[PDB]
Amino acid sequence: ELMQARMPTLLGLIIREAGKSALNAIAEVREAIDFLRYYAEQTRRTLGPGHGPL
Amino acid sequence: APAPFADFAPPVRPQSTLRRAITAAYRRPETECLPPLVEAATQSKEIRDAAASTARKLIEALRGKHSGVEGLVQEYSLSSQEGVALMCLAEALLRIPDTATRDALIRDKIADGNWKSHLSRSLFVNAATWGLVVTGKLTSTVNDRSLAAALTRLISRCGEPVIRRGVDMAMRMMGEQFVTGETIREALKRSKELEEKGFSYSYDMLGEAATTAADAERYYRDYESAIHAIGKASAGRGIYEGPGISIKLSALHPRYSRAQAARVMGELLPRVKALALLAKNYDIGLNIDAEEADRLELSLDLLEVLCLDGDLSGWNGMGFVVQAYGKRCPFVLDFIIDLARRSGRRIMVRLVKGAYWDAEIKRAQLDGLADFPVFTRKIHTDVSYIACAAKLLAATDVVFPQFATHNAQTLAAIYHMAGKDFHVGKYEFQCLHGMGEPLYEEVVGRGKLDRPCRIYAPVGTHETLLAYLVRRLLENGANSSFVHRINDPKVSIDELIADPVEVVRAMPVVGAKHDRIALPAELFGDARTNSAGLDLSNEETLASLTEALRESAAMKWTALPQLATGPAAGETRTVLNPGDHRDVVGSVTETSEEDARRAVRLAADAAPDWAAVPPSERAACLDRAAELMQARMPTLLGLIIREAGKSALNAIAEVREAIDFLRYYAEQTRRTLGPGHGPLGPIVCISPWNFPLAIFTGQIAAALVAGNPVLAKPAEETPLIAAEGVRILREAGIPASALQLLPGDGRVGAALVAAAETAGVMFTGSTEVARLIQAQLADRLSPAGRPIPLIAETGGQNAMIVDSSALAEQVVGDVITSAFDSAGQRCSALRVLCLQEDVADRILTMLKGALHELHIGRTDRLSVDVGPVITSEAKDNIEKHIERMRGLGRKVEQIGLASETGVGTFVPPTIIELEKLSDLQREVFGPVLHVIRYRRDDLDRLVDDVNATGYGLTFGLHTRLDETIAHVTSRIKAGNLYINRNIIGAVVGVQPFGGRGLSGTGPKAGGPLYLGRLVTTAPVPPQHSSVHTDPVLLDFAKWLDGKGARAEAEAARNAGSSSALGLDLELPGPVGERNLYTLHARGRILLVPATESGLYHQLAAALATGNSVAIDAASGLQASLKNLPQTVGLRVSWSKDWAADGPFAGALVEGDAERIRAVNKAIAALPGPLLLVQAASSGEIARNPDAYCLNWLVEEVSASINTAAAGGNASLMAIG
Amino acid sequence: PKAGGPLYLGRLVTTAPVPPQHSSVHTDPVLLDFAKWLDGKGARAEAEAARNAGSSSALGLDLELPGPVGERNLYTLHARGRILLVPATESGLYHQLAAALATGNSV
Ligand SMILES: Cc1cc2nc3c(=O)[nH]c(=O)nc-3n(C[C@H](O)[C@H](O)[C@H](O)COP(=O)(O)OP(=O)(O)OC[C@H]3O[C@@H](n4cnc5c(N)ncnc54)[C@H](O)[C@@H]3O)c2cc1C
Ligand SMILES: NC(=O)c1ccc[n+]([C@@H]2O[C@H](COP(=O)([O-])OP(=O)(O)OC[C@H]3O[C@@H](n4cnc5c(N)ncnc54)[C@H](O)[C@@H]3O)[C@@H](O)[C@H]2O)c1
Ligand SMILES: O=C(O)c1cccc2c1OCCO2
Ligand SMILES: [Mg+2]
C-alpha cells in the first residue's frame, strides 16, 4: 500500500538512479507491489506452525 | 408348443379410456402439451397481482432472514477444495463410532501430522456430494489428488481447530439437516417442535432401487418398523394432522419394471398392501413416491388394485405422487380423481415438479425415442404444475391435494387460486426438511397465511443419506432452481415473482422445446439422422409390437444363394428357434462350393459397373436401406428374436445398430470418397451369428459404399435375417451383381476367401477362424502384387475393475447387464469382474442376489431377460468350461432353469470365483462371469494381468477417483473403454468399436478409418489430423540429415506431420456421457526391409505414429542404423526370431512380389495377434510418399464416460 | 523455484508446505513399475514410499492462471531431467529412486 501510494516518488528515483524510462519504472514499482501481495497471499494459503524458518 | 408371441406383453388389465389418454400423452410434442396447461393455469388479473404481492412478501422475508459451511470456509480462509476435503475428512472421522476414540485420533494423530497414515477406502469417495455442498457445482468424478493436497495444506496450516469445526459441521449436517434423524425414533423426537407450530411430517426412509430379494426385504422391514413408530407417535391424530410415511416402490422389489409386471403384481403388490394395512390400523398417511417415467403407468396398476381392495376400506391415508414435469400429469390426475370417485377413497395426491429430469433426458436420447416424457423448459414444468393444481383444487371433495414446492411464486399462485375458504383437510402444502422451513414458516400459522405444510423428512444413517444425496441437492440447487436463485443476489425479486403462465403465453411459439436439448433423432445434427427405437414401457407400442411380432412368426422366411444371375439351387434345411427347436423359423438353401466360386467371378465381372456408381449415389442406397430397416423394424425384431435367440430389447438395439451403420457409412462416404479412392474389388464379408443383422449390415454396407461388390457369407446359424438384410439392400438400389448372398457353413466362407478374384475380406468371428483366414490369404497377392486386406474383428477377454469408491448398486446393474445380456454372446461381454478386496464380499453378495432375479427362457416374452445360447454345441462348450472350474474347486453360482428350457439350448447365467486372472485361459462365449479380487496396492499389477491375456476389446472401470481413472486408462490396452457404465452396446459413430491384440486388426467398425481400408488409396477421414509430432521421429529425422540421407529426412519430417498420432476428439452423443476418440501408437511394429532407403522410410512411418520397431536382422541392414540417438535406439530392436520377439502390432514389408508373399506367410505363422501388414516394393517407396499408409500404424481408442454417475448432470444444471 | 510462483516460499522454510493447486492426477509409469519391482522383492516399506511418492508428485500439473483477457497464461510441471543420486544404503537408494522416478526424472 505504501509503495502504491508513493509510486510517483519511487519512479523519480528509479528513473534517475537506474536509467529507467517512466514506463519501465512504473512496471518496476508495480512488480514490487505484486511480489509483496503475492507472497502475502501465498503465505496466508500455506504457512503453519510446522513450516519453520531457515 | 406355445404359439410365438402369444404372451409377449399382455397388460396388467384392459386399458380404460382414462388410462389410454395417459399413454397417448407419454411423448406428446411439447408445443401440443402447453396450450391447454396455459389455459387451465390462467387466473384473473386481480389474483395474479395478489399472488405477485404475496410471493414478493415471502421472498423479502426469505432474503431478510438469510451457511454453516460458508462461515467455516470464511473463518479458516479455506479454498473450495479445502472445504470439500475438510468435509470428506469429517465424514470419515464420523465413521469412527466412539466419540472419545475419534477425538483422540484427531488430537494425537490427525492434527499433528499424517492424516493418510490413520484414515482401503479413499477419504474422498463422496467428495462430489460435498463439492455440491461447498461450491454449488457438481463434478461427476473426484480429483482425489487435489483434495489430498488441500487436506494436507489445511491441516498443516490450521491444525486441530479446523478439524474440530469440520467434524461438528458434518455431524450437524448429516444428523440434523440432510436427515431429520438417523433413526425413525430420533426423527419423531425432533418433529415435535414444528408440529406444535402447525407443521406435519411424512417420513422418507431413504430406500430405493432394491437390487436383490434380500435388499427388498430389508427395505420392507424398515418401512414396517417405521410405520409402527410413526403410528404409535401419531396416537390417533389422523392422516391430516398426524404424521405419515412415504415409500418407493423400487425399494420393495428388485425387478420393479413394466417388463416384469406380472412379478410386480404378484410379489410387490402384496407387500405394499401389508404396509398399507398397518398404516390403516394406525390411521396414518402412506404415500407412494414417484420415480422414473417408465414406472409411472405401472405404479397406477398398483394404486388401482390397492384402492379397490376392500381390506383397506375405511382409510383415506393412501397417497400418490404425480410429477408436473411429466407430459402425462394432467391425464394421470384425471385417472386418479376418477379412481378416488370409484373407490370412495380420498386419495392424497402429492403434486411435485419432479426429481429425475436430467436422467429422463439422457434415457430418451439413449433409447432413440420420439420425444421426452418430461418438459425441456423449466417454465413449462411451472405452468404444468399450476394447471394441475387448478385441476386438483376443483376436486378437493374427492382427493386431498398436497402441493410440494419450495418456489414462493408457485406457492403464492396456488394460495390465491385456492381462495379464502379453508379448513384443515382441504389441501396442504409440502416441503423438504432442512430446505423448505424458511419459506413455510412464512406460511404456517394464524399469523402468516394459515395454511398447513407437511415436511418430507428423510430418515437414515450417513451411508443411506449419501447414496442419492446428489439428486436431492440438484432439485433445489441448479441454476434454474428457485432455491438457488433466491440466494443469487443478481436475481431480482421481480424476476422471482415473474408469472410463468403469462411468460409462456407470450412466447412466439408456445411450448417450444428447449433450444439446447436435442431430440433423440437429432443427436448428430446435420451429419445424419439417429436411428429410432421403441418404448417397451408404452402400452400402445407393446400392443402394436405384439401384433407385428405375431405376424412375423407367420411368415415363410427363407434364405437362398442369391447369385448375380438369380437364386441358386442347393441343400435346403430348416432354421430352428434356439430357445425352442419345435419352433421352425424358416428354411435356408446353402451354397455349393462351386457356386461360391462362381459368385466371386460374377462379382469380379460386375466390379467396374458398381465402382462407376458415384459415391454419393452409393451412399443414397445405404440411406434408403436405413429407411427401409427403420420402417420394417417390428418385423425384423420378430425374426431376430426367433432366429437368434435375442430379447426384444436387444433386437431393437440390433436393428438400430444396422440403421446407424448404414447412415454412418453413407455420411462418411459423402465426406471422403472421390475418384482417386478406387475400390479394392470383390470383398468377402463373413459375419457372426451373435449380431446377425447389425455386423452383417455394417461390413456389407461399408464395402458396398466404398465401391466394392460384396459376397455376403452369413453365419450358418442365422441366415434368415441376413437374407432379409440383403433383400432390403437390394430394394434400396444395390444391384444384384454388387451384393450376392451365399448362405452356408465355413466351407462356403473358405471357398470365398480362397477365390482368386477376392480382393479383400471383412471377418467378424472367433480369433481361431480369423487365423485360418489369415493363413489362406497369405498365399495370395492382389494383381498389383500386394497383400489382400483383411479386417478381422475377433474375441475379447473383457474385464471390469471396481474399486471401493464405486456405488455397489450401480456396479451390480452394469455387471449383470454386461455379463449376461444376450446370454453373454456379445464380443463386448464382461468376462472377468475384478473387485477391490475391501468391497468384494458385499458386491459379490449383491451380484449373486441379482443373478437370481433373472428370467431365462424363450425370448418371445417381454419378461425374459436372458435367452438361449445359439446351438447345442455352444451350450456343450460353455458347460464343459463351467464343470472344469467346478471340478477345480472354484465357487460356482448358477440360476436354476425352468423345465420349459429343455426344448431349447440354454445355459444358466453363472458366476465363477477365480483365484487369479490366469485361471481363465480362453474366451468362453456364454453367460459366464468370472470374479477375481485384488488388493488396492496391486491395481497396477492387475491391469498388467488383464493386458496379459493378449486380448484388448472392451474394458470397464467403476471408480469415482480421478487418480484411478488416469492410472487405469493410461495402462490398460483395450480398444473400447467404459467408465462408470456397462461395457456393451457400443454405438456407431459414438463408441467406434474394435480392439487390439487378439481382439482385432482394426480399423474400428463405426469409426472414421473404416472405409479407407476398403479402397486402394485411403482418403483423409473427417477430423483426422494432429498438431503433435512424435519427438523420436524428429530425432530420427535429424539423425538422417546428419547421415546425409536428406530425402529420407524430408520424408521423415513429412511423416511426422502427416501422422494423426495424438488426435483427441469428443464425439457427439447423448447428454450425461462423454464419448472420446483418440489415436495412439499401435505398439511394436515388425519391419522387414530390403534396402537402406526402404528401412529409413519404414522407420519414419513407424516412429511418426509413436511405435517402436523390431527390424528383421536377416535384412543385413544393421550397418545402416549406426550411432542412433539414444531416444531412437530405445525404440529400435533387431529380431532374428520374429516369433520370439512379439507380439507385434503391425508390420511393414519391402520387397518384390514373391518376397512380399514369403514374408506375409512368415508373418501369418507368428503366434498371437493377426498383424495388419503393409507391403511395398522399393520402387513404390521411391515413387509414393504414402506407400505405407499411416492410418494403419496408429491404434484407435474409444472411451465412454458416464458423467451422470454421481447422481446428476452438471451440464444440464445450466439448462432451464 | 520460480519467483512469483507457488513453489517459492517453500524453499525458505525447513519443511515445505503443499502449495495452492499443487497436485496432479497423473502417476509416472516408471514409478509404478519400480513400485511393483519393490513389491516382488519384499521391500514393503520402500514400495509404499514409492506409491506415496507417485501420488504426491505434482508432475503433470497443467493450470491456467488468472490474468488479463486476450492472453492465456499457463503453468505446468515437468520432469527436471536427470537427477544425481548419491546414496549410502540400499534403502536410501530405493527412496531416492522413488522420489526421482515419481517426478518423471532419470537418474
Ligand atoms: C415434499 C416433497 C416431496 C417430493 N417427492 C417427490 C417424488 O416422490 N418424486 C419426484 O420425482 N419428485 C418429488 N419432489 C420434487 C423434487 O424432489 C424437487 O424437489 C422439485 O421438483 C423441486 O421443484 P420446486 O417447486 O421445489 O422448485 P423449482 O426451482 O421451482 O423447480 C425445480 C424443478 O423444475 C424442474 N425442471 C428444472 N429444469 C427443467 C427443465 N429444463 N425442463 C423442465 N423441467 C425442469 C425439475 O422438476 C426441478 O426439480 C418432491 C418435492 C417435495 C418438496
Ligand atoms: N470384435 C467384434 O466386433 C466382434 C463382434 C461380434 C462377434 N465377435 C466374435 O465372434 C465370435 C462369435 O461369432 P461366431 O460364433 O459366428 O464366430 P465364428 O468364428 O464361429 O464364425 C464367424 C463366421 O466365420 C465363418 N467361418 C467359420 N469357419 C470359417 C472358415 N474356415 N473360413 C471362412 N469362414 C469361416 C462362419 O461361417 C461365420 O460366418 C466370438 O468370438 C466373438 O467375440 C467379435
Ligand atoms: O455389444 C456391443 O458392444 C456391440 C459391438 C459391435 C456391434 C454391435 C454391438 O451391440 C449392438 C449391435 O451391434
Ligand atoms: Mg462357429
Q: Which residue on chain A is closest to B157 by alpha carbon?
A: A48
Question: In this structure, how many other beta carbons lie within 10 angstroms of the beta carbon of residue B547?
Answer: 12
How distant is the alpha carbon of residue C43 from its chain centre?
21
Grouping H, G, I as helix, E, B as strand and the rest as coil, residue C44 is helix
Query: What secondary structure does DSSP assign to B630-668, as a single string?
Result: HHTHHHHHHHHHHHH---HHHHHHHHHHHHHHHHHHHHH
- Report the distance separating Cα B948 and Cα B973, nearest Å: 10
Q: Does any CB of chain A come closer than 8 Å to the CB of residue C65?
A: no
Q: Is the distance from CB of B689 to CB of B644 less than 8 angstroms?
A: yes
CA distances to B300, B361, B539, B1012 from B24, rounded to whole Å, are 15, 19, 9, 46
**To the nearest whole angstrom, how far is the Cα of A53 from the nearest Cα of chain B?**
15
Cβ-defined contact of C20 to A47 (cutoff 8 Å): no
**Partners of B350 in beta bridges:** B321, B402
Q: Does any CB of chain B come closer than 8 Å to the CB of residue A44?
A: yes
Cβ-defined contact of C15 to A51 (cutoff 8 Å): yes
- Report the distance separating Cα B88 and Cα B128, nearest Å: 10
Strands B910-913 and B1073-1081: unpaired
**Partners of B305 in beta bridges:** none
Tell me if B354 is assigned to a ligand binding site: yes
Q: Closest Cα to residue B466, out of B970, B121, B742?
A: B121
**To the nearest whole angstrom, how far is the Cα of C87 from the nearest Cα of chain A?**
25
**Partners of B1135 in beta bridges:** B1112
For ligand 3, say whether the CB of B985 is within 6 Å of any of its atoms. yes
- Which residue is associated with the grid cell 450376392? B740
Q: What is the number of the ligand 1 atom nearest to the C-alpha of B455? A: 1
Which residues, judged by CB distance below 6 Å to any ligand atom, belong to the binding site of ligand 2? B 686-691, 695, 713, 715-716, 745-746, 749-750, 753, 764-766, 769, 772-773, 793-795, 827, 923, 925, 953, 993-994, 999-1000
Q: Which residue on chain B is closest to A43 by alpha carbon?
A: B157
The 8-class DSSP code of residue B268 comes to I
Strands B580-590 and B683-686: unpaired
Tell me if B673 is assigned to a ligand binding site: no
**Partners of C62 in beta bridges:** C76
Instruction: Identify the chains in contact with B, defined as 3+ C-beta pairs within 8 A.
Output: A, C
Count of positions (residues) in chain C: 107
Q: How far apart are the first and last CA of chain A?
A: 28
**To the nearest whole angstrom, how far is the Cα of A51 from the nearest Cα of chain B?**
8
Q: Is the distance from CB of B973 to CB of B1052 less than 8 angstroms?
A: no
**Chain B contact probe: residue of C13, C14, C25 with most B CBs at under 10 A:** C25
What kind and span of H or E run contains B1118?
none
Q: Does any CB of chain B come closer than 8 Å to the CB of residue C106?
A: no
Q: Does any CB of chain B come closer than 8 Å to the CB of residue A49?
A: yes
- Report the distance separating Cα B265 and Cα B253, nearest Å: 10
- Report the distance separating Cα C31 and Cα C98, nearest Å: 6
Tell me if B765 is assigned to a ligand binding site: yes
Q: Is C86 exposed, middle or buried (0-12, 13-18, 19+ CB in 10 A)?
A: exposed
- Report the distance separating Cα B126 and Cα B85, nearest Å: 10
- Report the distance separating Cα B910 and Cα B830, nearest Å: 12
CA distances to B966, C72, C73 from C63, rounded to whole Å, are 17, 10, 8
Q: Does any CB of chain C come closer than 8 Å to the CB of residue A27?
A: no
**Partners of B1009 in beta bridges:** none
Q: Closest Cα to residue B349, out of B310, B309, B399, B397?
A: B399
For ligand 3, say whether the CB of B828 is within 6 Å of any of its atoms. yes
Tell me if B480 is assigned to a ligand binding site: yes
Tell me if B766 is assigned to a ligand binding site: yes
Count of positions (residues) in chain B: 1216
Elucidation method: X-ray
Cβ-defined contact of C14 to A53 (cutoff 8 Å): yes
Q: Does any CB of chain C come closer than 8 Å to the CB of residue B562?
A: no
- Which residue minimizes the CA distance to atom 5 of ligand 2? B827
Topology (CATH) of B539-793: Aldehyde Dehydrogenase; Chain A, domain 1 (3.40.605)
Cβ-defined contact of A50 to B153 (cutoff 8 Å): no
Question: In this structure, how many other beta carbons lie within 10 angstroms of the beta carbon of residue B202?
Answer: 25
- Report the distance separating Cα B126 and Cα B94, nearest Å: 13
Cell readout for B1180 is: 513404390
**Chain C contact probe: residue of A33, A41, A44, A45 with most C CBs at under 10 A:** A45
Helices (H) and strands (E) in chain B, counts: 45, 33
- Nearest ligand, CA of residue B531? 3
- For residue B145, which residues of chain C lie inside 8 Å, CB to CB? 23-25, 55-56
- Report the distance separating Cα B976 and Cα B973, nearest Å: 9
- Report the distance separating Cα B929 and Cα B893, nearest Å: 10
- Report the distance separating Cα B3 and Cα B23, nearest Å: 28
- Report the distance separating Cα C70 and Cα C67, nearest Å: 9
Distance B352 CA to ligand 1 centre (A): 6
Query: What secondary structure does DSSP assign to B53-107, as a single string?
Result: HHHHHHHHHHHHH--HHHHHHHHTT--HHHHHHHHHHHHHHTTS--HHHHHHHII
Q: Show which residues of B are catalytic.
A: 793, 827
For ligand 3, say whether the CB of B953 is within 6 Å of any of its atoms. no
Q: Cα C85–C91–C93 angle (5° rounding)? A: 10
What kind and span of H or E run contains B891?
none
Q: Does any CB of chain B come closer than 8 Å to the CB of residue C39?
A: yes
Characterize B246-270 residue by residue with b for buried, 16 or more Cβ atoms within 10 angstroms of its Cβ, and e for exposed.
Answer: bbbbbbbbbbbbbbbbebbbebbbe
Cβ-defined contact of A53 to C13 (cutoff 8 Å): yes
For ligand 1, say whether the CB of B290 is within 6 Å of any of its atoms. yes
- Which residue is associated with the grid cell 417397451? B536
- Which residue is associated with the grid cell 404475496? B54
Tell me if B958 is assigned to a ligand binding site: no
- For residue C35, which residues of chain B lie inside 8 Å, CB to CB? 940
Query: What secondary structure does DSSP assign to B710-738, as a single string?
Result: EEEE--TT-HHHHHHHHHHHHHTT--TTT
- Which residue minimizes the CA distance to atom 8 of ligand 1? B289
Q: Closest Cα to residue B860, out of B899, B915, B904, B917?
A: B904
Q: Cα C78–C84–C87 angle (5° rounding)? A: 125
- Which residue minimizes the CA distance to atom 1 of ligand 3? B985
Instruction: Identify the chains in contact with A, defined as 3+ C-beta pairs within 8 A.
Output: B, C
Q: Is the distance from CB of A28 to CB of A20 less than 8 angstroms?
A: yes
- Report the distance separating Cα B721 and Cα B639, nearest Å: 7
**Cis amide linkage into residue B1143, ω under 30° from 0:** yes
Q: Is the distance from CB of B637 to CB of B648 less than 8 angstroms?
A: yes
Report the CATH architecture of B799-1017+1201-1213.
3-Layer(aba) Sandwich (3.40)
For the beta sheet containing B1173-1176, the strands, ordered from the edge strand earlier in sequence to the opposite edge, are B1132-1135, B1108-1112, B1084-1088, B1146-1150, B1173-1176
CA distances to B220, B532, B644, B692, C14 from B548, rounded to whole Å, are 40, 17, 18, 20, 79
Helix axes B144-158, B962-971, angle to 10 degrees: 140
Q: Does any CB of chain C come closer than 8 Å to the CB of residue B937?
A: yes
Residue B1118 half-sphere exposure toward CB, CA atoms < 13 A: 7
Q: Cα B750–B753–B758 angle (5° rounding)? A: 155
- Nearest ligand, CA of residue B795? 2
CA distances to B709, B805, B810 from B935, rounded to whole Å, are 54, 14, 21
Residue B809 half-sphere exposure toward CB, CA atoms < 13 A: 17
Q: What are phi and psi of B580, to 5 degrees?
A: -175, 95
Query: What secondary structure does DSSP assign to B555-594, as a single string?
Result: S-EEE--EETTEE---EEEEEEETTEEEEEEEEEEEPPHH
Distance B278 CA to ligand 4 centre (A): 58
Q: Cα B913–B917–B923 angle (5° rounding)? A: 90
Q: Is the distance from CB of B1145 to CB of B1083 less than 8 angstroms?
A: yes
Helices (H) and strands (E) in chain A, counts: 3, 0
For the beta sheet containing B830-836, the strands, ordered from the edge strand earlier in sequence to the opposite edge, are B892-894, B910-913, B928-934, B830-836, B798-802, B954-958, B976-979, B1194-1202, B1073-1081, B1064-1067
- Range B110-117 contact pairs with CB under 8 angstroms and sequence separation of 24 or more: B110/B155, B110/B160, B110/B163, B111/B155, B111/B159, B111/B160, B111/B163, B115/B89, B115/B151, B115/B152, B115/B155, B116/B148, B116/C52
CA distances to C32, C52, C82, C93 from C89, rounded to whole Å, are 22, 20, 20, 6
- Which residue is associated with the grid cell 400459522? B445
What kind and span of H or E run contains B266?
none
- Nearest ligand, CA of residue B772? 2
Grouping H, G, I as helix, E, B as strand and the rest as coil, residue B110 is helix
Grouping H, G, I as helix, E, B as strand and the rest as coil, residue B800 is strand
Count of positions (residues) in chain A: 54
Q: What is the number of the ligand 1 atom nearest to the C-alpha of B323? A: 11
- Report the distance separating Cα B460 and Cα B637, nearest Å: 45
Question: Among A34, A35, A54, whose Cβ lies nearest the Cβ of C12?
Answer: A54
- Which residue minimizes the CA distance to atom 2 of ligand 3? B985
Q: Is the distance from CB of B361 to CB of B372 less than 8 angstroms?
A: yes
Cβ-defined contact of C16 to A52 (cutoff 8 Å): no
